[model samples]
Target: QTVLPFTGLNTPNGVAVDSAGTVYVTDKGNNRVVKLAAGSNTQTVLPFTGLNRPSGVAVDSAGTVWVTDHGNNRVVKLANTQTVLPFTGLNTPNGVAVDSAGTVYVTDKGNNRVVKLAAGSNTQTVLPFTGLNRPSGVAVDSAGTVWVTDHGNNRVVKLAAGSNTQTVLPFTGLNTPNGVAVDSAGTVYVTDKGNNRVVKLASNTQTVLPFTGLNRPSGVAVDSAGTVWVTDHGNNRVVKLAA
Candidate 1:
């Protein structure tokens, strides 16, 4: 197991690692995105200031950072100090993810749905809400498939790129799945908050990791090295495990 520097942040929620290995952490209690350079212990960047309880974070291919402000029910972007309010109609935004082409996706927890925000466009809801249930976390795969954790429904849903069709994960047994991430190999990782476990779904197989000691895992991110980083909200610490 490899451990990186802790941000010393209170209520750190979501985390993302860029291609360059720089780490971006959402310090929710502090209302900022703190960046820790690769192989370094000190924070190198704090992009957005005065955020309203930022909960989740994602870094696009262009190095733009997108964050969800749960208290404000909106998503904001950061390119250095400049702030870009891409979408404000979200209902309790909880998690965010960006596709390879720079398109943004967010989980609207209060509205019980997932919404898409196109690149450089102020308009949101690019994808219509189709039966999502208290969506809390989102991840976009290489094929542009949008995966969302439906907290109310206790399952994960997948929507094909530019299509409205939806596929439910587990399709059988799941409990309050809250966070999700997809790997380059097309495997989907989900955090079962209600069950106090992490699950892996791939090749039509579902494997539960037990996650014996974690409490209320809320967010997840997979590094290029296949290591899974999980935010333990109940424990107030981020935990890393082998994927």
Candidate 2:
């Protein structure tokens, strides 16, 4: 169920799908970002003046695009020279995600913490920082739950909305789990890096493998059409899996 390359994609590390089913990807090698139309596989590369080795991407509710410029030590909102909200102190930011309230969540990889930025301010808070091990990809659900992939810990976890308490998942098993994402119905799609496949967790926490056959899948995302896209790092291409 893998789709076309969608354009000159090289070393794609992150993928985000907007409400319209349009796909956005971080072409890491080119230090650029490209997106495919809702129903088209051809990629239309977008121009950015100062994107530096972007590694993660997300589209917020207002249609504003957010990307974590890992090389630049900042996250940027597209289409404006004026900084939306400049980052404070970040160490090797890897992934960027936005919550329902427009708050930005960044995986401060080198810092071993997930940094949360206020919706319209520069204030940043280190969320429930205990037990994180080189966290990478992050996702915020409609219910404001923050899902983070702790690569060093070999598990994915859910950080509750207000209590900010750590909740232990009924982990059957995992291996270098990398990126994590949640769908509208509360299904979680996790890319098991070492395992080279994407795993799904239903709302009720039942684990299942929708499909397999990826090579070092790094990033993952689900679209409104129930389509899944994964970055095959070893294969050097992005795949569109049939949901």
Candidate 3:
């Protein structure tokens, strides 16, 4: 349970960490992406602007930063010392995750689907709207499979790479799951917003973290040290838990 200083942010909804341990947060209300120095109590990197309600963020292996702009309905990439709006044509993009190979996956909330962008190609709809329902948060596993949190459907859907077919969690008890992330062992962690709990789904087991002070937990990320970080929207704080 480590509490870091988040004093200057306004309605932060998305977070990502680079290999160098620097943290980047999407200050949605401020319409900017802020970079926080590693282990420092203050911001170090300059804030990048020209965003609208940015909701999710990810960093590629090449140190490129990608962000999902919900209000703008697009994803922006920051790399090579330039901020480029490389991909557009999204329907309220909510969350984004990048693979080690530089592929970017974005969750389109309004359209209820996910889109994948190749390293140097235009954005393409990888997961259609056949079975998705308001897909909000997305994370790619080590096997390249995508795990998306269907907010409207209240469940997690797993889509294999390069395939349109999906395997849902099929659990009958989720409560408005919003944010999702996967670990190296293929374990999935989801923030159940309606239930105010963090649920873990592994091999054939489901467990809930006894988080009591959270409200509207939205985005989740797993650090290399096996610690889980959750964005509590209602409380305006990020909560960290040891796995």
Candidate 4:
């Protein structure tokens, strides 16, 4: 486990790791999204201007980056040095993830719901997750099963691929779980913010990692090499955990 060599990160919220091992982070306090290339410590803020409190970020298979511009109330897609608002009129959008087929999922926190934009479609449809209280984080697995961290409810819920039903995973005593991610092997990772720790769920077993001293960790991402990266929000740093 290691905390990457980074400085000046203020309230970083979301993190995503692409297949090439590049890392993208949403520096909410800075109102910018920065990219850390694979094996490099230097951070480059993307050439996106006018981003207000950029919150959640995800990278698609084709290297396009998606960010939820929280203060602007929209989701922006960055490609070819150009920005496009794929969806607009969101309320405090937080977490985002893209599936293998280019489908995009977002946690519309202020609306208390999750929505998805299918591949090549500009329309957004709310998922069947009913009665979600400030859902803050979202993740989609290889099978397209959607996982969400119901922050206000202090629980994690999932919708299996092709299924309209929602199943709340049996995680006991989660406190303000904020960010979630699913690795290729189907392991679910979550930053239990109020708990000040990250937990792993797989096959009905829960394993709380040793980072108990964390202070309000908010986001999590797992690289292709199985290394786990977390946005240690309160500490203002990103930590990397070996596979």
The local lDDT score (0 to 100) that residue 236 gets in candidate 2 is 74
TM-score of every model versus the real structure: 0.90, 0.92, 0.91, 0.96
Of 3 and 4, the candidate ranking higher by TM-score: 4
Q: Alpha carbon lDDT of residue 65, candidate 4?
A: 94
Per residue, candidate 3 scores C-alpha lDDT tens digits across 1-243 of 565567656677877766676677777777877776667877654445667888998886677888887887878777744455566567888989988777788887887778887877755755653577788889997778888888888888887766767888855588889888888887888989898888898766688876678888887888777778777777777767776
Instruction: State the lDDT of candidate 1 residue by residue for 1-243, as single tens digits.
Output: 344576566767788888887777787777777777877877865756668888999987778888887888777787757575667667888989988878888888887777777877867774564777788889988888888887887878888777767877654477888889999998888888877788898777788864557778777888888878777767666677765
**Compared with the true structure, what per-residue lDDT tens digits does model 4 show for residues 1-243?**
787766799999999988898889999999999988877878998978789998899998788999988888888888857566567557999999998888889899999989898877879888999779999999999898999999999999999999988999888779999999998898999999998999998777799987645899999999878799999999999988887
Query: What does the lDDT read for residue 7 in candidate 2?
Result: 65
Angstrom error at residue 105, model 4? 0.7
Q: What is the alpha-carbon lDDT of model 2 when measured against the actual structure?
A: 0.81
In order, how many clashes per candidate?
0, 0, 0, 0
**CA error at residue 27 for candidate 2, angstroms:** 0.7
What are the runs in model 4 whose C-alpha is more than 4 Å off?
none
Among residues 3 or more apart in sequence or in different chains, the pairs in candidate 3 whose N, CA or C atoms overlap within 3 Å are: none
Note the residue pairs that clash in candidate 2: none
lDDT of 1: 0.78
Q: Which scores higher on lDDT, 1 or 4?
A: 4
Highest-TM-score candidate: 4
Q: Which residue pairs in candidate 1 have backbone atoms (N, alpha carbon, C) closer than 3 angstroms, thus clashing?
A: none
